[model samples]
Target: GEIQWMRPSKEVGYPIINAPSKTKLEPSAFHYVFEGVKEPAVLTKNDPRLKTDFEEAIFSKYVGNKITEVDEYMKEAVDHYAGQLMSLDINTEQMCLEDAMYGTDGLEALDLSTSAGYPYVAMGKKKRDILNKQTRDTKEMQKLLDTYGINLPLVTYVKDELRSKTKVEQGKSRLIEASSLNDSVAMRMAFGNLYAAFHKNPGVITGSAVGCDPDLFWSKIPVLMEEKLFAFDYTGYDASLSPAWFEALKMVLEKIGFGDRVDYIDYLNHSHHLYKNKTYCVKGGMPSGCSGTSIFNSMINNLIIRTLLLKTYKGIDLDHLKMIAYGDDVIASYPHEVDASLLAQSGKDYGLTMTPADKSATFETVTWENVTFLKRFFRADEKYPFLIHPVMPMKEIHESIRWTKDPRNTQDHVRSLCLLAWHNGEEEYNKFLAKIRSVPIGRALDLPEYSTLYDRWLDSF
Candidate 1:
């Protein structure tokens, strides 16, 4: 299809004539000039000041002189009475003589005098004075000083001596010196007191309560019971990946031969069986919860509640094993080797294979790409172990790269990149290219092409 372009609109009007008209019908020979008129006068209209009186008599047929003085006197009386009423003390006097003079109903016209209506003005003035005095007083100021444990007497003495001493030689020099020393001592003591208070209760000084680790405290209960226990951990799915990426991952996993046995939807929705009867703890970017029947039942208990089910069907010895699941970080422990063997056997029965080759077999690291495999193989999966999953989305990467190359919006991110590049010195551009390549999906997103183009543009600099 061909694109169409519109033409610009035109203005329609008559052509303007700059010069005066050619035709002159009137003659200028008999023109008369006024002596006092420096310039020509424009005659337009006349005034009609007496129309009011003229109209009244002409219309009503009443021939009488206009009572202008009476109207003027009325206006003057109104002005005089209004002034007196405004000046009257309405607060002290309930009524004023001006009201009687003007035949007013004595509704107490709005008072304009300084003392007319403000009954609380004196009280307000006293309050303001007290506030000002409090603001200025050294003793009252000492309250702020008291927070630091400053001696009020010493501070007061220093302030008084400074006031009396006009010059360094005029007053008792020793007294001035002593006052200065006292002030310093008071300030030091105040600082020390504040420091001590802060040291004793850091939370109070910081205005925030210390964060409580609910999980850590809960995990310590078996120590109270004098029983040794093992802990098992589990990880959740990576929230950083997009739906498309997860779908791609599922495709990849299916190709890897575990598709029919794996529940990708359960993994995505966090409805997997690992979270069923487990005590999970999450710190620094994770959510935690606990479930299970155990030796000690408390709020922090992550013990699985389906202990009978696990024991009967899965051959898991609930009494001997404890599971602690964090995000992707799993820690499974047992009091004795026999219980561990039983747990491992049960895990194998459910297709949850344990790889003894891995160093952190109990505390395994799982990722979103391999979460389905974990669910298929591991009896438990923790969420925190997968914290290394990069949170940058494809859309964010696209936008950032686009804006970074744009001449208008490239300043901040590009400047940061430039600073990093400069610090890298002669290999700056190469380092920059390396960073872009290091970004997840860099190759898939054609970051290399963009980097090449950006380098070409930057080379001109």
Candidate 2:
């Protein structure tokens, strides 16, 4: 099985053909956890902040008497947040998974329980389940796409095309077996296409790890999703979707043969809380722990960023620059510093703001973590003209070890350090690793077979 990169401009089938419905859904249809309904319970409301003592406590503890009326703060927060969401014209139908594949024999593709990195829920899913499910869905989606004469091109397909257009750092190209590659690695490989294309001089390279504010993310999906490509379910949250996420989710379920769930899904779209002995109808955001939250957020981010890149750089010469994004990480290389500002403005236009980090001087040299043409991180001086080094950034390693909470995290960090130090065949990294591992870590002893050099030395004695 191959990894496919979604070509933002070419994805007509998912968007135009299978768009979710925009009809509003009634809120009384299903169970809500907040009201304490057995089959469908949920939560309550009161302008609790209105109480004089409560208001004083809130002001002193958080706002410091910033304003007299707490109600104004709530009102402005809702209006501003909701205003951004309302600006988007997509996703009139509230659904978590895109139903673009609706009416196709590919229900498995719509199941979030089978996807990796999704939060666990009543579904009782696991990592292996995600891998297996992705495989199944990929094959199924391929078949459906084949029938429609549509394409989801492989990473290698894009890579080789770019390589052909540019000069290769001889003997540097190698293929990682498909079975050994995860979705994360595959995406990095796809991003490599843009990296190779823009690696030349007169260009500046910068990267950022996109940080997310999930509350805004969850509330923002309903009107932002213009396409329906994949589908997934939400079965465990006791929380309601923002009225928009609710409508989006409801639309997909109804269109894609999930009519039995309409009542339950509807039960989740309403705003209500029991406050002051009154049933207050209230619009609420999604609850945490929903498996599809991160993936959905990533999808929306990826879509907007790619669209921005394409629109900004279309028909530009390789001598100028280009951009590539995978999930939250975005990297762009440009010939002119002003060109970078153009793309940044474009991102702001779409409500995406990225912080610049790991930047390189214009026309000097480029440094990306992965070997230029491969996913693995090993020194490949022979592979490219630029310096492609580091197994993991030393800074990242320090953070991981310093913030480690238990033996599992410590072991993983130590093991990664070991791999990093050993694979580069460099004595300096090994020396650094040895020195760090010599420190007695409090969590190291928790693992009887700890991999740290200090623990190993103590065991030897």
Candidate 3:
């Protein structure tokens, strides 16, 4: 048998898959798709799980619901917010749209000269197909646009949005890992810190959405756009037109903007091919990897939360009750049991799934996963006035070091080991180092900066 070694394109946080070859195999034998590997189930094409349509197969396995239900929630929530514009005066819609537009304008095109846009940063059919989506040939797209002179935005395809079922200690867990672009753009939009109140306030629940559909998500634009808020031309445009449609039209008329918003919507609504494999239109769902899905999800999510609280709790408190979200995962501070229960049902009403069907789950009840970088835990019984407590979880470092025993992976092993030492301290690092002694610590130390990390690790003690 020959050795068949597989490694990811970018190697900091990912692992190498080292497999033993059973027979002579052609280079074509390898089916390269995922960033990570799991055996027996996900890797093979014959697996029934992969044979069907991407959305149908995935939705059935991961999130079970009808298309009409998914489509209804988005319109219902928009109507809910539109009504809030008068009765509650929640006032969340306008500012959120302005911030979203500003961020959207900054990421209009992908640049090859700069490394700034990755994952979502622009690349062509050749380089892009290696890790990201496979779009229509660049020359083909360019020629089509040049002929029409429509100047449609340079659109990229979204991957199939596969669900990862893996072992978590004893029982297996399911997580749908989809692709989206605006993660970085939203960071620049400064949306993350907008709800620092989740940390400052006490009782909280870290609720995860069951499944989100982008087509149904934030599809309806605000009832009216403020003139000063728009960066592009909106002078004569009808207030009734969707913001995404207006953004699409700007590419034709202005010839200077990224047509991402409208293109993303068009792809979803028309059922464009994902990863050049599955062709299915998502009538309702927040797609994982579009450019603006997160901004839309957060915008609509907060509006629903605020509007729900106003009706149920009778008023809104800026300090005492609040919520922060990173896409579908929401961290809400609820002072009462009913507030948490109502938010879960509201999310369900908006087509998002709540975990414990009864809505009794809280920060204390569910298992903690390092889904968010914010390292805090809510302890209801704690004596501290603020129920939030600072806590750190160390699974990624261990998982990074898990496959380091192989000699060929020396560079990545060294990188992971140094990170482990830096995060967990020297003793734990040394313990794991002893297991991989034959892999040569000297080869890693030969690199100057890695040697410095080792010295720093020793010095920290």
Candidate 4:
């Protein structure tokens, strides 16, 4: 099994058709995450700001009504409340995992359920010292948390919120796995397979454009993904503000008939107070039992449990469907193919939709062209525009590892894929894997895994 990143790239059959370009391939000779592509600057939207009432609640602690600048207040809050903020350790156990892997073809395929302590970087210095604490010592905080029926202990992943001064940390000593890793991904993996099967054998459609068009995606790919539940991680929970989000969830839950759920979700937040919410986002300061997700499981473990966690649905729109949500991502299955009209209503109910397809498809554009569609480079604008697959799928590899994945930087993939697309297909592809296998890192790959493309070549020989 290969554990190191590959060199020369993989899947290319030719090792040295171009001698001048194909000398010794080393793992170091690859692109870091950000390399090519120069986009002409375009107009972009400004970022959203905090809601006014919420801002007033937080800023009032520092400067009263005199806090003029938001950034200034934030900086003051972070510096002043460093101790108290760091004490907001709720999900302290599962809060510090940094696992990454990246072989998938989609930039948006990886897990992105984490949030930063950007809010804590600065705060209005109206000057309340309560924000920083070494422990959840207050009665009022815990009292508020007690209402939600779960304990809300907090773990700060933000740099400024880290309270530990110990020389060695839990994350540094071992691989900190999110509690959601195995359970969540495995469930998703099964659903993903089922979703794929449905797409593969959608069979037939009628009365719509799908039956009429041979090129439509649903006609070709078939399976229709109905909705996704998206929302903030527990980032906002640490701030000593009211839990208005949950105060609003009773209506949403009524739609799914979880009107009789009874379980105390519980956790302590530093020394401040214990807190819990039935519909809180994943792995916040609360224990698993106190979470809305886990609580709903107590109600029913069927595929429809996620529908109970949502904040607003026409309330009955999901009575007969199957769905799942973990942290910020959600997926639901529909019994048919999709079309443009359905896509237009992505946000009609509550959730926005995304196409579950490979994002790495090739593209070639020119102001004027005889033609050219795939490949990193092609004759068009007399310009050699490089195509980058914005590698966000997964894996955080050492830059010089020898496996065909991870550490095999984007540059190597860029060159080899460029070779395959613009020049040779099979030869360049196989040659890359050969280089990968040669750079022995000695079983960096764990378990019953082996270098796939490289192993196939051995079989051929």
Q: Could you say which candidate leads in TM-score?
A: 3
Task: Give the 10-residue window scoring lowest on summed lDDT in candidate 3.
Answer: 230-239
> Which candidate has the top score in lDDT?
3
- Which stretches of model 1 miss by more than 4 angstroms? 1-226, 231-323, 328-342, 351-461
For model 2, how does the per-residue alpha-carbon lDDT over 277-390 read when each residue is reduced to its tens digit?
A: 112222333312222233333323333333344557654333233332223433344443334445555544433443333332222223333212112233433333233233
Q: Model 3 segments beyond 4 Å from truth?
A: 1-45, 48-56, 61-271, 274-278, 318-321, 334-339, 356-392, 403-421, 432-438, 441-461
Instruction: Give per-residue CA lDDT, model 3, range 1-461, as digits (tens).
Output: 00112223233332222212121111110112112333222322234445444323323322322223223333343444333222322112112322332323223232222222222332322223322123323453334323433212122122221223442111221212223223323322332222222222212121112122211211111111111110101111111122322222222212212232234444322221122122232333344444444444544444445544554555445234334444434544443444344544544443344443212334222222222213332222123222222222344333334332345555655554455343333454454344444344533443324346545433442
Each model's backbone clash number: 40, 30, 9, 76
TM-score of 3: 0.44
Number of residue pairs clashing in candidate 4, backbone atoms closer than 3 angstroms, sequence gap of 3 or more or interchain: 76
**lDDT for each residue of candidate 4 in 1-461, tens digit (9 for 90 to 100):** 00111223113221211101121332333233212221111111111221233212321221111112223222322222222212322111211111111111111122333321111111221112222133323343233223432222222111111112221111111111122222222222222322222223222110011111121221121133333221211111122111221222222223323223211211111111111111112221222211123222211211112222222233333332333322222223333322323332332222122222212132111111111111111221112222111111111222222223334344454334332322222353345334433433322312111234334323432
RMSD of 2: 21.8
RMSD per candidate (Å) reads 41.2, 21.8, 15.3, 21.6
By the TM-score metric, which is better: model 2 or model 3? 3
How many clashing residue pairs, candidate 1?
40
- Residue-level lDDT of model 1, residues 204-230, one tens digit each, is 111111121221222232232213332
Better of 1 and 3 by lDDT: 3
